[PDB]
Design a protein around this ligand. Structure first.
Ligand SMILES: O=C(O)CN(CC(=O)O)[C@H](Cc1ccc(NC(=S)NC(CO)(CO)CO)cc1)CN(CC(=O)O)[C@H]1CCCC[C@@H]1N(CC(=O)O)CC(=O)O
Ligand SMILES: [Y+3]
Length: 172
């Protein structure tokens, strides 16, 4: 049932990560991961996220999506770990069935695009995912192709990579 998570050696880490340049609003322009494609195609609408850099240097990351006529929000806290650009999950004891959570920012120019890699253990199944983030709702096709390449290098097939359609509700 799941494509194996890749060894973390296959996942680059953005060098000299600057938390205060990575903050603020991003659109999840590309998604890839071993989780199954959604059965509800309404989840294929573009979401937005805010990486709110807090006083204690953790981020309170809030994602919004449009679903069933409403804006649905979810906030999680990313606690910086010893390597700049890597994070674990704040107060994981508050998340039922979620036992492990890891974030690595793979690459970014801060002002246009980012790729962020996630690996978590939920119900003792190991999931991984990669997000392509844009400061605008659309990105250059060469960036989308690079994201596909990268996703396939971690063992993902084309049907586990998707490019959500920009919407105006909730996210702008
Ligand atoms: O990340 C997005 O922008 C769209 N996501 C879906 C997706 O990646 O396919 C959801 C969208 C979402 C929105 C609202 C509700 N709130 C309800 S149901 N209440 C639930 C689902 C939000 N996700 C949580 C999720 O995926 O379960 C993000 C939530 C804030 C912290 C960062 C987090 N993910 C960032 C990322 O994927 O790059 C990492 C991760 O998923 O672990
Ligand atoms: Y997500």
């Amino acid at each position: 049932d799941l494509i194996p998570a890749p060894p973390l050696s296959k996942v680059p880490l953005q060098q000299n990560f600057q938390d205060n340049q990575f903050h603020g609003k991003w659109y999840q322009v590309g998604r890839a991961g071993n989780a199954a494609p959604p059965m509800d195609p309404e989840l294929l609408l573009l979401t937005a996220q805010t990486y709110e850099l807090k006083e204690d240097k953790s981020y309170d990351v809030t994602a919004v999506r449009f679903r069933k006529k409403m804006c649905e929000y979810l906030t999680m806290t990313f606690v910086p770990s010893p390597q700049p650009g890597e994070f674990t999950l704040g107060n994981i004891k508050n998340y039922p069935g979620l036992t492990s959570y890891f974030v690595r920012v793979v690459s970014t120019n801060y002002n246009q695009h980012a790729m962020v890699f996630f690996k978590k253990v939920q119900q003792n199944r190991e999931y991984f995912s990669i997000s392509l983030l844009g400061r605008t709702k659309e990105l250059a096709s060469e960036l989308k192709e690079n994201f596909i390449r990268f996703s396939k290098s971690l063992g993902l097939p084309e049907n586990h990579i998707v490019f959500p359609v920009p919407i105006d509700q909730c996210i702008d």
